[PDB]
Symmetry: C3
Subunit: 676 residues, 3 copies
Amino acid sequence: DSFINVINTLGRNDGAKYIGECHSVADLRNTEPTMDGQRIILKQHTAGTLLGGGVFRALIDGTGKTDNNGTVIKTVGGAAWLRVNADRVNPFMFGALGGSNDDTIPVQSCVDSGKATQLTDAHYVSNIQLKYNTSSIYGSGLHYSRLHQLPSATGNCITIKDTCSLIVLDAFGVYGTGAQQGTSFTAGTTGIYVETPSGLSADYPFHTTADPRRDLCISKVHIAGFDEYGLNIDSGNFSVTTDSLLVNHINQVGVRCATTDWTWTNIQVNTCGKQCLVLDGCGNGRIIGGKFIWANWQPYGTVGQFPGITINNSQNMVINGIEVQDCGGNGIEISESYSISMNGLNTNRNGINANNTFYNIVFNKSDAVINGFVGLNYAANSGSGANSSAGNFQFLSNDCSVTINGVVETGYMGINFIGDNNIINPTNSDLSINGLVNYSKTGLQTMNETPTFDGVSTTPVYVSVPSSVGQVNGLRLSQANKDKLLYSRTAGPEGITMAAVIVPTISGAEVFNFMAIGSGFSDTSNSLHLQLVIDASGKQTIALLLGGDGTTQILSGDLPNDLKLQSGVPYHIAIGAKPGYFWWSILNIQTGKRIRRSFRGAYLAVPFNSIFGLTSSLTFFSDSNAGGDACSGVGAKVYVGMFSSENDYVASRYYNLINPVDPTKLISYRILDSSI
Amino acid sequence: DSFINVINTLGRNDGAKYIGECHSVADLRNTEPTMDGQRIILKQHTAGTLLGGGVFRALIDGTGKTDNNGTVIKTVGGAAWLRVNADRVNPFMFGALGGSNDDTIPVQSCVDSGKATQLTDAHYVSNIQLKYNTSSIYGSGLHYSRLHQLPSATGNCITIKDTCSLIVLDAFGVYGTGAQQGTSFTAGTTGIYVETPSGLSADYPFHTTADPRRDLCISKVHIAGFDEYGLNIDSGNFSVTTDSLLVNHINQVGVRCATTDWTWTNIQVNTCGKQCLVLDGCGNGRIIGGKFIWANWQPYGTVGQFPGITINNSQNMVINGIEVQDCGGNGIEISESYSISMNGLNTNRNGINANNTFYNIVFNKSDAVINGFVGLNYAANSGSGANSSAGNFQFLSNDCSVTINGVVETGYMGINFIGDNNIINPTNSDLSINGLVNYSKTGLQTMNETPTFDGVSTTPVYVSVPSSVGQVNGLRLSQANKDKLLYSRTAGPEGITMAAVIVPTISGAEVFNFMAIGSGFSDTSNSLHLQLVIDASGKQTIALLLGGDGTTQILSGDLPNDLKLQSGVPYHIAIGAKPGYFWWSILNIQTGKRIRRSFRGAYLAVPFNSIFGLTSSLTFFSDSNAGGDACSGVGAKVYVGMFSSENDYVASRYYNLINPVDPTKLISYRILDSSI
Amino acid sequence: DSFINVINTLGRNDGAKYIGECHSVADLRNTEPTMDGQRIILKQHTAGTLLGGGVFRALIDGTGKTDNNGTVIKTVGGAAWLRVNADRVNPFMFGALGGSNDDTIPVQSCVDSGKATQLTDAHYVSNIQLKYNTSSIYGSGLHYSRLHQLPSATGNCITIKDTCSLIVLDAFGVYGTGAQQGTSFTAGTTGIYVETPSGLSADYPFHTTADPRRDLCISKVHIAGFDEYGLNIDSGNFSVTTDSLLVNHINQVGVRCATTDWTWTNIQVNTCGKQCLVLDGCGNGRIIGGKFIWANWQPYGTVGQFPGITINNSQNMVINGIEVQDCGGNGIEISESYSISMNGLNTNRNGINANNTFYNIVFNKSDAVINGFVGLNYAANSGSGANSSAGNFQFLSNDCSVTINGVVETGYMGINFIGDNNIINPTNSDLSINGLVNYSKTGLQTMNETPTFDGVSTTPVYVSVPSSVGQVNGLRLSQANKDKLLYSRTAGPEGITMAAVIVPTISGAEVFNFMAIGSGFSDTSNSLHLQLVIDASGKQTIALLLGGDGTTQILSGDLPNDLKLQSGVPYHIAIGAKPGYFWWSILNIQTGKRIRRSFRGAYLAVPFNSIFGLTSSLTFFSDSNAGGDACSGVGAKVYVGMFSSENDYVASRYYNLINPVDPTKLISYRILDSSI
Ligand SMILES: [K+]
Ligand SMILES: [Zn+2]
Ligand SMILES: [Zn+2]
Ligand SMILES: [Zn+2]
Ligand SMILES: [Zn+2]
Ligand SMILES: [Zn+2]
Ligand SMILES: [Zn+2]
Ligand SMILES: [Zn+2]
Ligand SMILES: [Zn+2]
Ligand SMILES: [Zn+2]
Ligand SMILES: [Zn+2]
Ligand SMILES: [Zn+2]
Ligand SMILES: [Zn+2]
Ligand SMILES: [Zn+2]
Ligand SMILES: [Zn+2]
Ligand SMILES: [Zn+2]
Ligand SMILES: [Zn+2]
Ligand SMILES: [Zn+2]
Ligand SMILES: [Zn+2]
Ligand SMILES: [Zn+2]
């Protein structure tokens, strides 16, 4: 009778509704099991949440088990209910609520549970401590599964204690008050802190006491919105690996490391009020793949300059494939550091808080070997006028020992007459750049072809030069006498480099013929002229005139008023010329300020091969013909070499602003101090 | 009593069968809960599959919940059944069937669900879109957990929408029609497409609109079998990280990237009908660890040549530790690109679709700094005769600015008389290789020892040379007069390099003695000879004669007919010789085709130290004794230097085929244009 | 009535206890379902274990299903019970017990199951084989989730079979008998072995037969405590990726690889009885980010020397950003290898089993290009006296072709008079270091300023030198005649390098003035002295005397007895002197043993600019004034050059111990063999 009816009721689709369950862990503690391994259903952890439920099985004898409020629940009678859960725990098992609830204690219980933790959601916490080799954390993304520090909390969102080794932190977020872009911070906060070990263990990897061997992996973790540090690895910790770490929106320092013996791969740090990265006392570590951008972010309101990267008091660092870009101040400051090795390095368009003021790498009492350097300044290339670095390298001391190789000057056209290196400050440090011999340090014997002085009167006249030219007198340049220096050498297909110190006297309308190849200007003149043209109103034009290959082309540009050459000021004026590749540069030797243009590819109507068929001779301060325009002012330190890129020209200027470009290519070098 | 039978019936081992369950989600929609939080068992998602079942709990008030056919199931009365599932969703929860079923909608439901997706199986789909910061996908392997595009589908298997950021794609496969090797493709398909963002958001990382910050990780993903692209990252996307990406069997382009600001580590692309990798307008990115093989794969039937890697219109790239190998055409084509930095670069055995035709790196209007280059051509080393690159480097324009350092010629024996660089095309570009000064660009003063002419008659005779020798006449070489050039210099333990242009007159049987150290040939001769021996049938043998260290050795080889020297053709003939290290090279200066062999280690019976005991003098075109064999033809541009590796010899040939090898090692250089 | 009491009983909180269950998988085989898809609860896998339970669903039609003892259970009647389990399996489902139980068979069942395996715990095993593309393994940490080889087992803990491709091994430990530090091993054990493939399939990636394409990822795996190998990848396997692999405590070789075409990133190997890493016949591979430490670990009792890294019979390797440190013998031995490319390389403080005995890189019949080299020997820098490498580089043959660039000598102070290179053995190999021209190999013409001889008698006297000086006689140095060499050249702000061979006659108390800048010693003397001061007891002090910038400073040190200069022994004595930067070096040219000190930064009271104001001339063997102290012994091979770092000085000594430092900086070089 009732039997058949009971069975049919239980057999309907909703039949599970008739099996009772505990409505809270509090009920579970008041439910005594009557048999071993007894199964019980938990509807939820805390009454009225519908979260944290599951199935439990009983141990009648609970001695040796401890109530942990989520996976081991003990009854008054001493039994233990064990959550059926083979693998990872999650905070809801310990009473987490999600939303805006403070889930600190549930989360702390997970990482203390003896198993890895899965973040399935976002949880607010104040401060969490990772203590054990079981304290791993996994999410399923850099954003939606995350810990989020409460607005009222200070200190470290996560602290990795010195008892915690061999864990994985993978694919979750660690967010602070300022995680969303453009929002404010809570003072005194850090995303992840790895404390300094207080001792050394002898039973690794089974240690339960302090040990310096972190031997742990932070993998695809997103840290965002903290005040003092995103990630801060303190001294004494070994083998903290990071891999695809992403740090965003830090009020101060994105990442600080102060320890040895570690490797990071594919790190990105973006938008910090101070440095993106501080290496302070680091040694014997590796950074492989790095992007450090928008350091010294002005809206975060920090007073003072801070570089994209601080490398201080460090040694034996290999840093490969990193980029430092769009930072508000200097790119990289290397201070009091030994043996910094960098292989593939990109620094461009930093110093964005004040135009033409900061430098991409600043050396101070440091040694470094840097290869594969690049730094196309994309603001200079597009001509947008946005703030960017004054130049690539600055040396604050002369006791550095530094080697730099790469593309020191990129070689785009220069729409705004500027490039990567717009202020060049030479150094007396033990510097080698691009394998170029420093002319001041060589005893190498070279050819030195003698030019012939020409003018209406053929006696050279010498007049005073400013003392920054490093000589007493130079060659008097006048339009009336057509003072010039003629070489019989003709340009060949390998190209030529020509440079000189010129002190222009600038008055009215005038054509300055700084230097030329050949003479004349026509479809068959096979000639080059570098000219400064001044009109009656004082407007200045730098013009490159090319004739040959059956045509002519004028590559000219009007200088803005703030870039004009000034009368009586010494400039180093240089050109590189070869088929299909012409560049010019004008450098104020007193301020280091430079203007430049480079012409390749579509900027040239033709390559102008016929300029270089060994028919057109080289002349300084005019062309080779008696009727050519000349100059007004003084000339000094005339240099003829085989072709140098603008890359190498700029590189050699870090040795000295007016010396020969490349001793191994030097053809002629005439001081012109009362002799020719 | 009926109580006791019910209780006993449920208590049997199979008692669970008496608790009813829903047989489908359709039943679930027709089951109204009678209590809040009611538990219900779902047998399966779709009737008759036994897949996708689980436990659900009821919300009586389901307003604000939407039926999604998997984890939220709505009743007619408005209640909501919520699947008990804390973490990731999988397609079976939404009705996927696996096997040959089109599981597109179940999979799309997963990635739209608000949580990460776990692939537990292979699922056919047509097209999937990833839209949200929750749209992560995880598998458990590169093959068995995968999405598989249906043969009838076209377009992108996966599209990452510009609203989707901060996700992880980890450890699963994305397969197309051609995933299995040797199979055909479906026209118009792409594995993973990252679309161009249409806007910029101001509330990252909480954005719900278009944004360029992908900030996501593709990790241990296997893409195979698509037509147009495996992975295609379009313009405007930042921070798409790839890590251990594997791309296989792509009909056209393995990976295309067209954006800036990203890092990849350990990428492998294998077997593509066109490029393995296209970088098109990329900038400020990093590739760290890369293997690009079997590009331009002939069986995929693409018409035309395509390099392993195209780098076009790109800038500020750091590409470290990559290899390009076994590709059908050129290795890497760099076009219209600035500041490409490469540190540790391996290109070998490309050009496999046509022997001796393609080059490992092709530069066209580009600048690059390349360090740590290697390229052991394993086909040349094994003597297999398989198609391989003509040589390492080719310059399509002379406006490139390029530095290359490394092992340009590997230095294995040369069983088939070839090596890495078998056709050398010199360039007038702004090129620097291995830090070698280009002789045509230097004004450096060196020693230039004067040899003495010897012959039966001691008056030199001069005859014309082909115009490719770059002079009017050379030294007449005859066996009758035994014309030779004697140096008093003896070879020392650092070794020696000797080279000359020789225009051989080849007629009958004859011994040409190109150059020698010392004289005689015996156990105590302390001598070296490089000879071409021609027998009565016209067969040519290149013989290296070594005498000293108590023995003699002849290292000879018969030249195949297609490699024989031709009468009246100018060849640059060079040797480097030192204890334990001898190499020779013969270079056709009109075609650039080269033959060579190198001897170190086990190939030498002894080091032949005593050749270098400062006792044996250097001679060109004979040995030092009056009875020595001589030459027939004309000699020119005799070069003596200190020891250069074949690496540096070959590197210097890219400057010019006949000029001195190393200006810093130059001891003598005599043109022989009607003077000695 | 009774119906409501049944309902009330089933409805109590513990009501779940009334639904029966199978107490073991054996019972499940004896429980016949009476309905298709029937649900059953399994209490546990094995009776009395409380492990491996779950829910199963029945298929009455069991054809096509095979009993696997964990997830498919067959009844006597032919039904099949299928474990409800969408994703990964774990060993407890197959009867694992954990703890001290041998769980080999349960773990083997997992990896053969057709799905990936999750390790939730530590499991003892003997030997496991990975056979299928489903045989992935995931844990949740490098320690607590792991396989542990039983002490009684030998051989390979894990073998990856050549049928197994495209799997992931992620975040678990593989432990052997010696996993805990300081414990003993089981002979003949290996952690992970990748066997040599026996064939090639044509249906990759769907192959079920032998194939060389492993195409798999070992990620965050921790291998520890095995005898012969931690990880051993045998020949013929392609694309075994490792990423964040950690190997600890290996009795013999940490990692062996013997195959081609692979990439590793961020590998760490620590504490091995023999090598940390053996590359045996490897080619066309990449290692990017590596740490290899404590190789040849003395307590593991291996007899004989073994390097940190063995590279033998290998080719086309790109190895970037690795470090080898604290190894017992040599750092890296490169043998019989072509084209080894290394970019960013740190080797320091190896050879710790015997002080001053081993070298950081040992080359034997190999070619290599090494850039970004660093190696700050932290033991020499701290003055701890701990055993460390004799020096950076050693060449076992003269047929190597090697380029090295970086920080060859770091330039720290030298508290104990030593540095990175304390024994220098020059080589006749084809070697280039730091781009320095080898003086023995150059024909470059340089300046060679002639000094003037001074003495009480102005006729120089010549006496014999030891034959190791490479000349018959040198300049007789005496205190009575004050024999000296004066240069009129004055030191400038760029600095100066001075060096000479001095054969000191050491007797009583005496002041040797090896070389000087200027004369006198006072606040305005603007002078430098390098002195050896000997007192009446025989104590030797090396003193650098600096006067200028308004002050004086004496930088002196007492030599320990074992570092004293010996009478009649030739020493190469060198200084680099520049503002803020002074170093000196004393090199025994017969043993190669060197002592040295360097002064920068805080070690200097002032930069001493006024020494370099072009007022103080250079003198050898005394100062410029008639009253200066002189020397006792013989002088030879006097060298003046522009400033060289100690880095370049040391680098050039690998060419030859007594030759000029830098041909491009050479100002004077006087042999002094019976002439001035
Ligand atoms: K690298
Ligand atoms: Zn939430
Ligand atoms: Zn504070
Ligand atoms: Zn502590
Ligand atoms: Zn005139
Ligand atoms: Zn025209
Ligand atoms: Zn003109
Ligand atoms: Zn139904
Ligand atoms: Zn399937
Ligand atoms: Zn859009
Ligand atoms: Zn990685
Ligand atoms: Zn004769
Ligand atoms: Zn002979
Ligand atoms: Zn003879
Ligand atoms: Zn039983
Ligand atoms: Zn356990
Ligand atoms: Zn096999
Ligand atoms: Zn003195
Ligand atoms: Zn004083
Ligand atoms: Zn140098």
